[PDB]
């Protein structure tokens, strides 16, 4: 395959609770995609041009625990379901796609890379439907073009009877539009 991924855990349940409370995370950061957790749920952030982007429905208005204490969001767009923190030192920052490809790859929290065909500005179909359970906890994950650049971040699954056949996503252009208006 072209694009491949693996994950590495860094913190367990106890570490997560404490870190949530102190807002201070001293762990080394690495990787293009951060696996995030609050008290109640898990999701992903994709690092694009120095900013960690994720979904508002996961992060709300919360700070991100960091090496110098809590990191305030620098972009918050409720209607777009989009938030961003400045990326901590160590994060591998990706580049937006400029090739316009409609052949996408979605990266899940399990580090699977799955084929998506773009069907609209914010919608792609899954070439092979999956149980929605497989996609839970993956909101905020990148949709990449064949060159591995960011087209968008995964927002919600379009499902029938617990089966996801398509995904709604936030185009990498919305990130731009949010940063302008700010």
């Amino acid at each position: 395959a072209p694009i491949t991924a693996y994950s590495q855990q860094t913190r367990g349940l106890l570490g997560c609770i404490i870190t949530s409370l102190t807002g201070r995370d001293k762990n080394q950061v690495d990787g293009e995609v951060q696996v995030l957790s609050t008290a109640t749920q898990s999701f992903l952030a994709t690092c694009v041009n120095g900013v960690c982007w994720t979904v508002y429905h996961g992060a709300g208005s919360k700070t991100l625990a960091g090496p110098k204490g809590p990191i305030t969001q620098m972009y918050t767009n409720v209607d777009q379901d989009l938030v961003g923190w400045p990326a901590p030192p160590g994060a591998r920052s990706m580049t937006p796609c400029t090739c316009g490809s409609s052949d996408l790859y979605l990266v899940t929290r399990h580090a699977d890379v799955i084929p998506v065909r773009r069907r609209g500005d914010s919608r792609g179909s899954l070439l092979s439907p999956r149980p929605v359970s497989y996609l839970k906890g993956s909101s905020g994950g990148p949709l990449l073009c064949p060159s591995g650049h960011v087209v968008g971040i995964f927002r919600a699954a379009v499902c029938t009877r617990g089966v996801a056949k398509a995904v709604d996503f936030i185009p990498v252009e919305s990130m731009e539009t949010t940063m302008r208006a700010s």
């Binding site: 950061v29 995609v33 951060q34 696996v35 008290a39 625990a65 809590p70 990266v107």
Partner: peptide
């Protein structure tokens, strides 16, 4: 109102 926490990462190839 606690912070979001990084509990893992994903490395791409």
């Amino acid at each position: 109102k606690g912070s979001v926490v990084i509990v893992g990462r994903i490395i791409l190839s």
